[PDB]
Amino acid sequence: IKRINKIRRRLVKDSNTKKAGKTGPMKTLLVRVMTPDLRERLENLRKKPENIPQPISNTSRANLNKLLTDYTEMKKAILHVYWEEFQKDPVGLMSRVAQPAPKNIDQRKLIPVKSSGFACSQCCQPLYVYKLEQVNDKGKPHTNYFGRCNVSEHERLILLSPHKTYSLGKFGQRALDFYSIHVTRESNHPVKPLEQIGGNSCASGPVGKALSDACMGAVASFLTKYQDIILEHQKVIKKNEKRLANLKDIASANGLAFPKITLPPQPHTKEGIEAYNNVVAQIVIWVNLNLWQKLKIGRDEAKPLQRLKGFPSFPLVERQANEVDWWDMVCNVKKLINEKKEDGKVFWQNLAGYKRQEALLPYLSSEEDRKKGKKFARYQFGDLLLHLEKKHGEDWGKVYDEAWERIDKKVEGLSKHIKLEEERRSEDAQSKAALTDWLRAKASFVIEGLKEADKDEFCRCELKLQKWYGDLRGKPFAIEAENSILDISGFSKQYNCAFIWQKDGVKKLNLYLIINYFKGGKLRFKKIKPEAFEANRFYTVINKKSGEIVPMEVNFNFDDPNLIILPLAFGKRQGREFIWNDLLSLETGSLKLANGRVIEKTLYNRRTRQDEPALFVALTFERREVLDSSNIKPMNLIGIARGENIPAVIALTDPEGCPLSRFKDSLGNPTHILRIGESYKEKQRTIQAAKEVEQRRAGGYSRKYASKAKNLADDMVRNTARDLLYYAVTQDAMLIFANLSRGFGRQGKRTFMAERQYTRMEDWLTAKLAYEGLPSKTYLSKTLAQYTSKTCSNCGFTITSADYDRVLEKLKKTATGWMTTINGKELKVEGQITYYNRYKRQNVVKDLSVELDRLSEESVNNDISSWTKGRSGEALSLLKKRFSHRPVQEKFVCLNCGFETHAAEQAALNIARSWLFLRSQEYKKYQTNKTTGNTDKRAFVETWQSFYRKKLKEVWKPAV
DNA sequence: TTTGATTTTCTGCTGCAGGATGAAATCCCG
DNA sequence: CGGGATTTCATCCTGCAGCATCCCCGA
RNA sequence: GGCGCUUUUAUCUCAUUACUUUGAGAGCCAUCACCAGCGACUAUGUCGUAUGGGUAAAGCGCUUAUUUAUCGGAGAAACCGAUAAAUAAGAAGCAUCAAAGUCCUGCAGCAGAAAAUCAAA
């Protein structure tokens, strides 16, 4: 039996309970609002229910729509105002958003600055730096840099972060007094959206307090990103400046003329970023055109320059809402293309004989292109021209007329058909793509004749037409729908947002979420005896800051025109988790409601094959009781080898290191190897291939395939976490992850983001572990991953590039052929090497000795040491691939013993073995030696090998 | 015979940062 | 007066160390 | 690629709600040339292509009546008991079980896809 909540119940039972911390673990519940569509779906059941709930009233829906619209307008207005202010003065704004220290840090300041890092804007006076050194629990001291003015009204403790020349450190959302400047009537600011946008209809307090943090979070995040990147840009500039001289030196070494353009300094806007990147791109283009190709120079001798990447933007106001109509762009294309009839006509009708053959070169398709199921419209146009030439001879005056007429007919038919389809309700994706492609082909055929006469005019037309082509191709899949949100700061009587329910002597309670934001609405509260429940009365509870729970009664009327009433809909599992759980009771106070939102968003429906706006309610819950982890002590161990071909391979061993035959294979025999998450890559590749095949046809995949990959990946990671946690808890053990840097993954050519699932698995497993209050260091740990995939299990030797160099020097030719030895073990040089360097794309293999004999053609007596750098690079490469320990991803071969086994399993066992080693004593002795500056990793390799075969001799009896 | 640079556009998925407000004070206000 | 309705404000804490670890490559 | 069946529950020692998903579970249906795209050419078009937009499909059975032929009244003749099929209708158990869910706001980076510009292999 594998059920996650069963494991949670066992973990709860076998431990004690205690209260949570200041801010306990948090979890979010997402349900749906009762809409008449759900009612109709419920009424179509084969077994109709007896008590069908009532849907939302028409009165509340208009209130929700109006209030969400006003909310969006107000947020946009505030963002616009602050965008203008930032565009006026950056430094002032970023100095206005700083987060001061809590007003309890009044310990005696000891050393002031020995000074003008920043300045508070109220008095426009520079802030002076003050330091303080503290010793923590672990004894490591750190110094805090603070900013304080000389004016008593401005003597705050704004924190600073030093640099090796200072930075702010933290931007808070509640630092700025938003309410007193943009809501209250005393302020004379010209922008009062509640007074202006809202029409003086909504309550001031809650709406203003919500809008405050909603804007402040975004602006603080943007400013933090800007302050973080301002230093990385400086580092990139200083690094890239030196490289220019090296490129200049290499180009000048052959008398190359290099363009004279300078590098602008560090920009503080987005336009200077664009100019600097344009300069860098120009330099890179010149280098590629002149150095790498013509002079056959490698990239590492003349390394390329870098760009300035990652520059942020101010929220929501720099988004270019390129709202254009499809037919308008079509009309522009048709009007502009019709202008250039006569010039192209003259050009084609007044050409010579053999220049025509080279002119129509882009109009012939290769045989490889021809066979691939379909050819492009341009090539089809070229074939049409070829047919006209074969039909009518050399009379090229009339051929342009015939081509123009035929393309006119084709475009006219496409336009008529497209218009006719989208008249009623139909939308065709493929037809629009075909029309755009034919328009592009016609444009190219017309404009080819001006590519040399006037380049400036021709280039402007090129940019115009390519922008038009891109927009025409991308519009029929552009998404215009955007979310709409409604914050609710907190669930207390202050904010006037009720979550109420009723009682019948048991937890069976009817749900309702009530919002009172408009003026004139009535909604009261009444304090009651804790157990004075009455029939047909709605109840609720109000949490207290001190930790008391107040059973608090709510009374109101369902017919109030200024109220909003929301009934919810969910499942039994959700209710058992949050609403009426048995261990965590919001009635008692073990669970506390924090806040929530109201979300309307897109959703796919298979019945209509469309996306329709639907309402959602997100509620956040914070736990107030956690478990104790003082009574836990795992003994056994499991290693995990994360990857893409197999998302999870696990192996279990005892503390002694002996594998445990406690898992049943597909044949029912005991073993120590399991594979979780298999066959997932095939589903992902199927989804991706469907996306590609639909993208080739019409330029984009319909909304049916929009979110399949994310859902499948999330299911994989959640089930994998459940399985791993089950295997841990039921076997009395502890997991061992490999130490991998965050965001690790392969960035290549056939890579997709759905498969980068290492950090996601680790984070999810930590989250599900920490929800019960346990530290991640108890049921989880990470250790070194070095040499884990290079270590043999039978002989223990780890292959190193240093060994390759040693073995290569020994190799020579004998009567039997080329031979070599390793540690007294003779090797035979007779093999074949397979590989796949795209391009030709066919199975090609190479002989080993013959190529080595062929390599011996350019040398006498096969003196390998005398070979040049270029030909020696081939020499070790051939031996590296033929003697590789991983010729195939799932198959491993050893060199010193020739062992054959699955690759991941051995590495998985080596993970646990390494985790055991790192807490052994041989590691300590290595630490003592290396402290003297001997940063020789080969000593670590030697220590690894020595410790490994020391242990293998007695406890690790090899499998036979 | 595809390729490595650059340009145009559309998409989705991940990796960062922010945060998950109630208490106390006035000011009314019929 | 009592009960809303708008108005400020401020807030506890300090993972424990070595260079690959899932990558894959011409006639 | 779709069509009717929905469970299991992760709380067996105790209860609610329908939500968003994942898939491993039987049975059945994917035909038109109305419009477009495409390939080959007798070529300002003709044929095939079902590649897209539309248009019919998608469960057992009994019960009820009708229609074709048969065993039934030898008769084959109404009326049906049944035999095989088709038409129409309503109850009918539904042929279907097994697991998960922390949100949102804003940015940036990657890869997917066609198209445009230079040179070399």
Any chance you could write out the topology, listing elements then pairs?
Layout: H1 4-13, E1 17-19, E2 26-33, H2 36-43, H3 58-88, H4 90-96, E3 111-112, E4 118-120, E5 125-131, E6 133-135, E7 141-143, E8 145-148, E9 158-162, E10 166-167, H5 178-182, H6 193-196, H7 205-252, H8 271-292, H9 326-339, H10 341-349, H11 355-359, H12 367-371, H13 377-392, H14 396-424, H15 429-447, H16 455-474, E11 484-488, E12 497-502, E13 511-515, E14 524-527, E15 538-543, E16 549-555, E17 564-566, E18 568-569, H17 572-579, E19 591-601, E20 604-605, E21 610-611, E22 614-623, E23 625-627, E24 636-640, E25 648-653, E26 663-664, E27 670-671, E28 673-676, H18 680-698, H19 708-731, E29 733-738, H20 759-770, H21 776-779, E30 782-783, H22 801-810, E31 812-813, E32 818-822, E33 825-828, E34 832-835, E35 844-847, H23 849-855, H24 869-882, E36 892-893, E37 900-901, H25 903-918, H26 922-930, H27 937-952
Parallel strand pairs: 24-29, 29-30
Antiparallel strand pairs: 1-23, 2-18, 2-22, 3-5, 4-5, 5-8, 6-7, 8-9, 9-10, 11-19, 12-13, 12-15, 13-17, 14-16, 15-16, 19-22, 20-21, 24-25, 25-28, 26-27, 31-32, 32-33, 34-35, 36-37
Helix pairs in contact: 3-4, 3-7, 9-16, 13-14, 14-15, 15-16, 18-19, 19-20
This protein binds three DNA and RNA strands through helix 1, strand 2, helix 2, helix 7 and helix 8.
PDB class: rna binding protein/rna/dna
Keywords: CasX, sgRNA, R-loop complex, RNA binding protein, DNA binding protein, RNA BINDING PROTEIN-RNA-DNA complex
Assembly: tetrameric
